[PDB]
């Protein structure tokens, strides 16, 4: 369940998320969905750089 079909090619702000999970193994499609500071979240390409970036940082906060 909880599924991403598209992700956000836009620009991420490392200060705005707050947290982070992999969608069900369910999926057709994997993503990383991003949970911001209000509680959105953002369906990110696994593959792409600044996701991987995005991980990385967050991760280093604990």
């Not at 079909?5 to 499609?29: N, V």
């Amino acid at each position: 369940r909880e599924c991403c079909l598209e992700y956000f090619k836009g620009a991420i702000p490392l200060r705005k998320l707050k947290t982070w999970y992999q969608t069900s193994e369910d999926c057709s499609r994997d993503a990383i969905v991003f949970v911001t500071v209000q509680g959105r979240a953002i369906c990110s390409d696994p593959n792409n750089k600044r996701v991987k970036n995005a991980v990385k940082y967050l991760q280093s906060l604990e």
